[PDB]
Structures are given as structure tokens and as C-alpha cells.
């Protein structure tokens, strides 16, 4: 996260770290959506241009964390993966369309002050909140700058951007399964996700019921925090029918 701040303890209790077993390293962010299911970006698990195709036994999920590098004894919980599910129409060849994946845990994780699931949006919450200018929150342990790494989880609040501005900021073909967020050059303020934040959540706090909803997944960008560029996020609601089908069929 560029131009963010340290998270408060328990501020993002759905935060998940995707962790490679060997070598032991951070791979991506992710989010907890139930006691057995974790949501992430497909490109965190499958990206053939970079020879990336992880299997379940390659990975661990670390939940309840604050420090990036410490083993947070008596606080974090480490879970093994039962199965990975990647969206069948995830477009890794072109533009990362439908950049979404689910991970089912081998055993349910115990909720605590530090571990708690985020809600997924209904159609009405999505329609009400996914408006240009409305702000969401992005969290992660990724790099602090494009060109270093944080001691603890970082947080930044960023406004959703009008779709024509998103489209005009890039040569990549944007789809309805993506949205973009960030400040414009004339707005003064700054902030973006960066390398290592991929797969983590873009959340919004509903003013109707005071619950946090995951509207986006950190998907892609061109650099980090560049003027005139915006971060792109998987549109969770538009892919929720697939999420539900997976959980109903395999949960």
C-alpha cells in the first residue's frame, strides 16, 4: 500500500495473507468470507505468463495477522488448503477479466477478536455504494512504493472513479467485471495498492446497516500511485453468482 497508514489492531479481521511454504514468503492478500472459505484474485494462483500455477499443497493461509513478518503466536491462525477454485472464464491471456478465486480450508478457523468474516454484497448494497466519489478501503502488506516493505498491515481509503475516466487512463480493455479507484491528479491526495497487495479486499461500510462489505479484490495496476493511473479491482458483486455456485456445490 502506497501512502497509507498502519492499521489499527482488529481493523480488518477478515484480512488473509497467502503464504508460500517454500521459500517462506508472502504471495498475495485475500479475505475471509466464512469459517471455511477465503476469497482472492485468480492471478495470485494462476498466471501462466510468469509460470505461476500453484497447487493446494504449495500454500498456506495466515489469518488474524497484523505484523507482516512475525509469527504472531496466540493471535494468528495458519490454515491448510483443501481445494482451489478459479473462475472458469478468468482471462489471464488478455486483461485479467474475472480475476477471482476461492480457497476452501481443510478445517474451519476459529473466530476471535482478530479473525472475523466480511460480508459479500447484495445487488442493492452494490447499486447504492458503487458510485463515483464514494470511498472504499484497501488493506495489505504489499510494497510502500513502486520502486520498501511495511512492518505491519497498511490501510488506505480511496474513491471509486467514473468508468470513462478509468477507461481513458489505460490502453488495457476494461470490462464490467472491473472497477477502478484512486485520486485524480487535481485532487491532491494520493494512495494505491502495490506489489504484494494483490488479492486483498476493497471494502465499504454500509451506512444502512453498519456492516462492512467486500466490493472489490485488488486486481491490477500500471505502476503504483502514478498520477493519472488508477488501481483496478475485481467487481465482486458481478461475479457473486459464481461464488455462490461454488460454495453451494462444494461447501
Amino acid at each position: 500500500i502506497v501512502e497509507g497508514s498502519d492499521a489499527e489492531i482488529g481493523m480488518s479481521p477478515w484480512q488473509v495473507m497467502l503464504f508460500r511454504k517454500s521459500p517462506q514468503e508472502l504471495l498475495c492478500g485475500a479475505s475471509l468470507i466464512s469459517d471455511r472459505w477465503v476469497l482472492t484474485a485468480a492471478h495470485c494462483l494462476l498466471y501462466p505468463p510468469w509460470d505461476k500455477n500453484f497447487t493446494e499443497n504449495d500454500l498456506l493461509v495466515r489469518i488474524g495477522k497484523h505484523s507482516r513478518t512475525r509469527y504472531e503466536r496466540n493471535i494468528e491462525k495458519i490454515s491448510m488448503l483443501e481445494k482451489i477454485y478459479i473462475h472458469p472464464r478468468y482471462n489471464w491471456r488478455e486483461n485479467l477479466d474475472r480475476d477471482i478465486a476461492l480457497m476452501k480450508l481443510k478445517k474451519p478457523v476459529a473466530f476471535s477478536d482478530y479473525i472475523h468474516p466480511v460480508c459479500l454484497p447484495d445487488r442493492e448494497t452494490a447499486a447504492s455504494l458503487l458510485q463515483a466519489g464514494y470511498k472504499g478501503r484497501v488493506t495489505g502488506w504489499g510494497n510502500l512504493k513502486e520502486t520498501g516493505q511495511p512492518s505491519v498491515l497498511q490501510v488506505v481509503n480511496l474513491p471509486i472513479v467514473e468508468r470513462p475516466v478509468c477507461k481513458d487512463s489505460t490502453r488495457i480493455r476494461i470490462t464490467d467485471n472491473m472497477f477502478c479507484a484512486g485520486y485524480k491528479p487535481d485532487e491532491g491526495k494520493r494512495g494505491d495498492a502495490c506489489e504484494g497487495d494483490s488479492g486483498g479486499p476493497f471494502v465499504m461500510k454500509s451506512p444502512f446497516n453498519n456492516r462492512w462489505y467486500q466490493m472489490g479484490i485488488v486486481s491490477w495496476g500500471e505502476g503504483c500511485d502514478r498520477d493519472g493511473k488508477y488501481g483496478f479491482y475485481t467487481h465482486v458483486f458481478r461475479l457473486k453468482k459464481w461464488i455462490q455456485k461454488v460454495i453451494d456445490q462444494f461447501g
Binding site: 479481521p13 490501510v155 481509503n157
Partner: peptide, 28 residues
Amino acid sequence: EADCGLRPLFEKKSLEDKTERELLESYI
């Protein structure tokens, strides 16, 4: 889950975090 999105150390205790008000103020 039934209590999804309600954080133990914040909403469950009626404590606000340091920047959530910035989000609310943008929901015009």
C-alpha cells in the same frame, strides 16, 4: 455469516476506527 462485517473490536463494541468517518462522509 449472520454477523459478517461486524468487527469484534469496533462495531461489536460501538467503537469507531480512526478513518471510517471519511468513508461515511463520501456516501452523499
